[PDB]
Design a protein around this nucleic acid. Structure first.
Lengths: 157, 127, 213, 178, 52, 170
RNA sequence: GCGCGUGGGCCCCUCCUGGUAAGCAGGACGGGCGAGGCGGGACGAUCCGGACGCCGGGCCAGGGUGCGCCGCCGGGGCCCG
């Protein structure tokens, strides 16, 4: 790596998709953003102002500042033995809202909902904790249709 | 002249720790010195090297500093020191200093006999 | 008054134990009978009775602390396996079982029998009270730290560990990781399936740990 | 071999005993520790560690700061683990009961004239060993000139003054002069 | 050796991988001036107000 | 070595309510090897990995050793050059014992380990059909053969009795 | 907060690059030696196990078990190391 310019090794990263070359859909400029929202950063090749760096591509941050045209987002970049909060200003074309905590927001709502539903009917409270798969129960399986399977012979040569 | 019963006295190593290569050279004295060479076989404690001084070899606290008789040792130079230092202990025994002259060592032995204090070097300068 | 409370409490734990030891013994005997009857019913119907999947594994570290990979070391420290020949009980969930497969080369695991659990809890069991290794010689120490979880006596302890019950985490953490004698180990390099010793030994863990206790 | 180098993160150094040659400070630390052992009152847990602190850790508290701190609580006995000092700027000191390791002569006269009682740690142990009706107050630790210069001056976000006189253009007149 | 990255990730993870500290997330550095002036104007009223 | 008939199926899914139950007879030293060899065959034959499947049962079969029976095993083994197929007949009391004989002869002559040999078929061959000359030799009722190794007895006895007055006659 | 040493590294795995190659010259995740005793691979800074207070008893890894040299026999197959 003799040369290290702002856009080096960006042949594939800052290049548009097979049938996605063109002008940003107007939704990018119509999406409301609020401070503390999680936003994924993915560069758009067509737009060359407010472009973040290739490191920032694939990073998720919170919006510290909302500004007339670019939103300031703060990511955590591991520099050697310390993670540093890198505040960057990125134009709308390269900032996309992140589902990120969307699962947690759904869980908080569902856990509260299944608490009230119980207070009314089905009074025993439901388990609102995730269980990581767990072992299978004993069960019973019919072996009436069981088919014998045998190793097949070699035929390649 | 007989001490408290006490327990078995275990000496972890009977022989003294000798400095590495003290045997080859007279200039190197046998007094233990820690090996600090970049490539010292004794620092690396290879197989067959001489044993290294470590706190693990330390004697039991109960039997540390104890003479083979079973009494610890107190160094006496004058009759006042025997009376003050050996104030009714059954744990420690007396030992007159090398400097104390024969004449004084008779009056140090006599007071000791009256006080029933064991003197380890009783037969010293005796003529 | 404290001695009077201690005498009163000791009797309550002894009473709970004289009852639980008998209640739990029926549960273990019934479990063997229930699987046998379910199997008999299934074979008459041309069906097969699958038994229930194991809910607890006995993991024994069989490799040394030299040259351990960073992920391997981290996972082993969370299993509490910090020295060779150490043994711990772990729950069976995707989170534990995926981590255990990463460290398979360093460990041997299997479903433990109730007698294997009893022998480890009684002969080699030591508590973790105040971050100290306190030997479990009486039902009083277990009562003191596990009465909140209803694990008053040793029979409650060998039952919670075996059934992987609600108070399994508390029960397991109360036990300092077991320190065992050196394993026989036919081959430390290969998996028990390839004929070595590492990885899943299944029911054979009971035999493997037997000598080590 | 046992792997004790994973979730274990070394040991910390906390001064468990006062390095003070003064016999008085050692006499109080041992006393306040004895009270703490028998009754684990947290007021005594702090006082025991406030007597083990260094001079730099134990900053001075003036009778002006103490007046402001005890504005709503005149009845409560201020407990300071350092020197109480006078503030000539405050013309009128309110009556206050203060217990300290030392009171400056100018401060001691002022508190007594106000009608307040200057207590001592031995007096506090005799009357309120557990610390009832007493507030453990502290001076500003980072008021020392040494603390102001800690850091790397000449780094963009440092905001600290350089140690020497320097008196030159490069690096000082803004980010560009570097 | 002109260059080595060996051991560098052992040194980094020996006492490192450290969080960027609090008060860095809620810092007003790089926030729009007009928003910051509005915040100060709003704060200086009734319970939030800290002046005499 | 023990003979285990192992049953297994894919996990039940919304796409297929009851996946097909498969049955294989695997000869292995223990149950854990038998369930591993089951999944090795299932992965290739029916595209079922262990994670995607369950083991319904691993039933161990008991086989009578009262009479020696002619047994015939069709297997496939990998040599360094490449894979090959081989039919071996061994006369043994039980089918597991015959599989042990087959595995030891394969290790001895073809230098092939258990893992690189797949057992396509194990059958009990009739006395009439014995393509291998060795099994055909003992099949006939009258088989008087002089002791193959009567040297072993005297050599074994001489280990305990190192020094003997006379050289032993065989 | 104050400081010290260090800033000639080397080796095994893994993908590497240049070169005909090299116990070659350069990269790299991890580990080792450096700065890890000890048993074993005949020998061997790094390989296989195992990482060290001082000892006594027991277990046993890795490697083996004719004799030097501690410790082996049983069975199946092959059979000019």
């Amino acid at each position: 790596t003799h040369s290290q310019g702002y856009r080096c090794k960006t042949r594939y990263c800052f290049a548009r998709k097979f049938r996605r070359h063109g002008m940003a859909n107007l939704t990018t400029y119509n999406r409301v953003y609020k401070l503390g929202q999680y936003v994924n950063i993915k560069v758009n090749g067509a737009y060359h102002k407010g472009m973040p760096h290739r490191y920032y591509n694939g990073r998720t941050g919170t919006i510290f500042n909302i500004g007339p045209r670019a939103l300031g987002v703060q990511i955590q970049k591991r520099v050697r033995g310390r993670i540093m909060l890198k505040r960057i200003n990125v134009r709308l074309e390269h900032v996309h809202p992140s589902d990120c905590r969307k699962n947690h927001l759904e869980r908080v709502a569902a856990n509260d909902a299944a608490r009230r539903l119980a207070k009314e009917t089905g009074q025993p409270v439901p388990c609102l904790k995730r269980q990581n798969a767990l072992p299978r129960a004993a069960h019973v399986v019919s072996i009436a249709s069981a088919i014998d399977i045998t190793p097949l012979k070699y035929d390649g040569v | 002249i007989h001490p408290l019963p006490h327990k078995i006295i275990i000496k972890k190593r009977k022989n003294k720790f000798i400095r590495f290569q003290s045997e080859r050279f007279v200039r190197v004295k046998p007094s233990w010195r820690k090996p600090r060479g970049i490539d010292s076989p004794m620092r690396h404690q290879y197989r067959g090297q001489r044993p290294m001084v470590s706190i693990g070899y330390g004697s039991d606290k109960e039997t540390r500093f104890m003479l083979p008789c079973g009494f610890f040792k107190h160094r006496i130079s004058t009759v006042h020191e025997l009376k003050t230092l050996f104030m009714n202990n059954k744990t420690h025994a007396a030992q007159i200093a090398h400097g104390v002259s024969a004449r004084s060592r008779k009056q140090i032995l006599e007071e000791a006999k009256k006080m029933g204090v064991r003197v380890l070097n009783a037969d010293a300068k005796l003529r | 008054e404290r001695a009077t409370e201690k005498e009163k409490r000791a009797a309550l734990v002894k009473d709970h134990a004289v009852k639980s030891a008998q209640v739990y013994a029926r549960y273990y005997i019934d479990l063997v009978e229930s699987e046998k009857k379910a199997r008999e019913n299934a074979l008459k119907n041309n069906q097969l009775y699958v038994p229930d999947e194991p809910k607890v594994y006995l993991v024994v570290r069989i490799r040394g602390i030299v040259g351990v990979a960073p992920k391997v070391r981290t996972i082993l420290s969370l299993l509490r396996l910090r020295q060779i020949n150490n043994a711990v009980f772990m729950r069976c969930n995707k989170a534990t079982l995926n981590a255990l497969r990463i460290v398979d080369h360093y460990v041997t695991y299997g479903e433990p029998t109730v007698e294997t659990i009893r022998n480890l809890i009684y002969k080699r069991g030591f508590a973790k009270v105040n971050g100290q290794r306190i030997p479990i010689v009486d039902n009083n120490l277990i009562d003191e730290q596990l009465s909140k979880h209803n694990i008053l006596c040793a029979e409650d302890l060998v039952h919670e560990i075996f059934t992987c019950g609600s108070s399994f985490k508390e029960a397991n953490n109360f036990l300092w990781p077991f320190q065992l004698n050196s394993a026989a180990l036919k081959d430390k390099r290969n998996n028990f399936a390839e004929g070595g010793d590492f990885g899943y030994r299944g029911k054979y863990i009971n035999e493997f740990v037997a000598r080590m206790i | 071999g046992i792997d004790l180098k994973t979730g274990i993160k070394k040991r910390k150094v906390e001064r468990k005993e006062p390095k003070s040659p003064n016999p008085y400070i050692r006499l109080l630390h041992n006393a306040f520790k004895v009270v703490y052992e028998n009754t684990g009152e947290d007021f005594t847990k702090v006082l025991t560690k406030r007597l083990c602190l260094s001079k730099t850790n134990r900053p001075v508290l003036s009778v002006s700061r103490l007046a402001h701190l005890m504005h709503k609580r005149e009845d409560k006995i201020a407990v300071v683990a350092s020197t109480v000092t006078n503030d000539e700027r405050l013309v009128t000191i309110p009556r206050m009961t203060i217990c300290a390791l030392k009171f400056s002569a100018t401060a001691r006269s002022r508190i007594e004239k106000a009608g307040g009682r200057c207590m001592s740690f031995d007096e506090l142990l005799a009357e309120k060993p557990t610390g009832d009706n007493c507030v453990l107050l502290q001076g500003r630790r980072s008021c020392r000139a040494v603390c102001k210069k800690f850091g790397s001056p000449g780094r963009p976000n440092s905001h600290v003054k350089p140690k020497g006189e320097h008196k030159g253009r490069r690096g000082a007149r803004g980010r560009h002069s570097w | 050796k002109n260059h080595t990255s060996k051991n560098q990730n052992r040194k980094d993870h020996r006492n490192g991988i450290k969080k960027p500290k609090k008060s860095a997330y809620t810092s007003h550095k790089g926030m729009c001036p007009k928003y910051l002036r509005n915040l100060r104007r709003s704060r200086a009223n009734d319970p939030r107000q800290s002046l005499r | 070595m023990q003979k285990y008939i192992v049953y297994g199926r894919r996990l039940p899914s919304e796409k297929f309510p009851e996946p097909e139950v498969f049955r294989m007879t695997i000869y292995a030293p223990n149950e854990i090897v038998a369930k591993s060899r089951f999944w090795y065959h299932l992965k290739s034959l029916k595209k079922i990995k262990r994670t995607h499947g369950e083991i319904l049962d691993c039933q161990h079969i008991e086989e009578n050793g009262d009479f020696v029976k002619n047994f015939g095993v069709l297997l496939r083994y990998r040599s360094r050059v490449g894979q090959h197929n081989m039919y071996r007949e061994v006369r043994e009391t039980t089918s597991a014992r015959a599989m042990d004989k087959v595995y030891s002869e394969m290790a001895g002559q073809c230098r092939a380990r258990y893992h690189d040999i797949q057992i396509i078929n194990v059958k009990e061959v009739a006395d009439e059909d014995v393509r291998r000359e060795k099994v055909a030799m003992f099949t006939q009722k009258g088989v008087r053969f002089p002791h193959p190794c009567p040297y072993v007895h005297v050599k074994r006895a001489a280990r305990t009795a190192r020094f003997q007055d006379r050289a032993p006659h065989v």
